[PDB]
Amino acid sequence: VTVRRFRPEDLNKLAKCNLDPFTETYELGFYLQYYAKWPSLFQVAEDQHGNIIGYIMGKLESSPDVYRFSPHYLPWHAHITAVTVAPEARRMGIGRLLTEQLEAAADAADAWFVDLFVRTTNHKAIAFYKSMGYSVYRVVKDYYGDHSADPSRSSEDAYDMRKPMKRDVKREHIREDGEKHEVDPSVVWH
Amino acid sequence: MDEL
Ligand SMILES: *C(=O)CSCCNC(=O)CCNC(=O)[C@H](O)C(C)(C)COP(=O)(O)OP(=O)(O)OC[C@H]1O[C@@H](n2cnc3c(N)ncnc32)[C@H](O)[C@@H]1OP(=O)(O)O
């Protein structure tokens, strides 16, 4: 397995990974926007036969300055927008390898933390991130527009998970009891 | 995974 930057020519090769039920298929322009703005953070894992068996998409940012007085304001941080590894290639360290490389970029950029949204029913991913030092910071109610298991539910909550980076010397951006803190999707901004 |  070799890790390298995503290139647009890879767009037709993500299909196998995106069959996974916890992996979203975004619109073309979305992938291409991450390629344009954060190309170093859009990485793919390819096997010896040329197939893409995983990828990760990340970004660096803070909340818009107009929200600087909100208790929900996010300082400069790295965000994992998507990560996925083909089911035949799991538990080989690919997910961790992709994540560690993004963390290294976040560390070099003085990010306060790395965060991500995860479906509350995605126990595999939750166990993965917890093993790497991520914890739940808050629950975003109704973040996902559908449920992963129950079609009668109109939505599914997200855990917003965070791993502290070394800039957070006082650990003021992580919580021990994050599952008890709920927010509405309206405090997630773009 | 970000919401669609
Ligand atoms: C939005 O994207 C953020 S939330 C959605 C995450 N993506 C997703 O759910 C898509 C489908 N799942 C996967 O692609 C895949 O399961 C990952 C990406 C969640 C994990 O990929 P890997 O299988 O390549 O992970 P590794 O680096 O091999 O694992 C490292 C350590 O993580 C713990 N782990 C991983 N999977 C686990 C399960 N199913 N149960 C418990 N613990 C798990 C282990 O400690 C593992 O170390 P080992 O030495 O035990 O393998």
Side-chain angles (χ1 to χ4, degrees):
Chain A
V1 60
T2 299
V3 178
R4 62 156 172 90
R5 284 186 179 198
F6 166 93
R7 52 190 169 257
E9 293 89 340
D10 296 328
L11 280 169
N12 291 331
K13 297 159 181 169
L14 308 184
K16 184 68 192 64
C17 284
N18 292 359
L19 290 170
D20 172 78
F22 289 98
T23 299
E24 193 64 62
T25 299
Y26 302 105
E27 300 179 9
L28 267 186
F30 184 82
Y31 295 112
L32 294 174
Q33 172 187 329
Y34 276 74
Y35 165 68
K37 291 225 283 183
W38 298 285
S40 78
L41 302 184
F42 195 167
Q43 297 277 339
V44 305
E46 51 177 355
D47 71 3
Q48 43 200 349
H49 309 106
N51 306 317
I52 293 175
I53 56 171
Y55 64 86
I56 187 169
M57 311 171 63
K59 60 182 169 172
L60 289 160
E61 63 178 9
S62 59
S63 295
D65 276 332
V66 67
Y67 299 118
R68 61 190 184 107
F69 295 118
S70 171
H72 309 296
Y73 174 84
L74 308 188
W76 185 245
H77 68 281
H79 183 75
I80 300 165
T81 291
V83 67
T84 189
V85 175
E88 60 267 35
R90 294 180 187 169
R91 310 297 293 269
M92 308 182 79
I94 300 173
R96 180 176 46 91
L97 180 63
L98 291 171
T99 307
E100 281 175 349
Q101 185 185 20
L102 184 150
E103 294 182 12
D107 175 76
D110 284 353
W112 286 92
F113 52 85
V114 180
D115 71 359
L116 61 99
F117 297 113
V118 56
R119 287 178 178 268
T120 61
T121 62
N122 190 355
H123 60 268
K124 291 176 178 172
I126 293 165
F128 170 68
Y129 284 117
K130 278 182 181 174
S131 78
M132 294 186 300
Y134 294 71
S135 57
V136 176
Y137 178 71
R138 59 192 175 165
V139 180
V140 188
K141 299 296 296 184
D142 305 314
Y143 175 76
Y144 295 102
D146 72 323
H147 202 266
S148 77
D150 187 349
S152 73
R153 295 264 304 264
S154 67
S155 66
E156 187 175 351
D157 299 347
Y159 294 137
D160 179 10
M161 298 188 78
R162 289 176 175 189
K163 177 177 183 171
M165 295 288 100
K166 70 186 191 296
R167 183 177 189 178
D168 192 10
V169 299
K170 296 182 291 193
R171 295 302 199 256
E172 60 194 63
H173 295 292
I174 63 169
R175 285 172 172 143
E176 182 75 5
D177 55 336
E179 291 93 338
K180 298 178 163 62
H181 297 261
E182 300 187 359
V183 302
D184 188 63
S186 69
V187 299
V188 175
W189 310 293
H190 299 75
Chain B
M1 199 68 48
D2 281 7
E3 162 54 357
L4 179 62

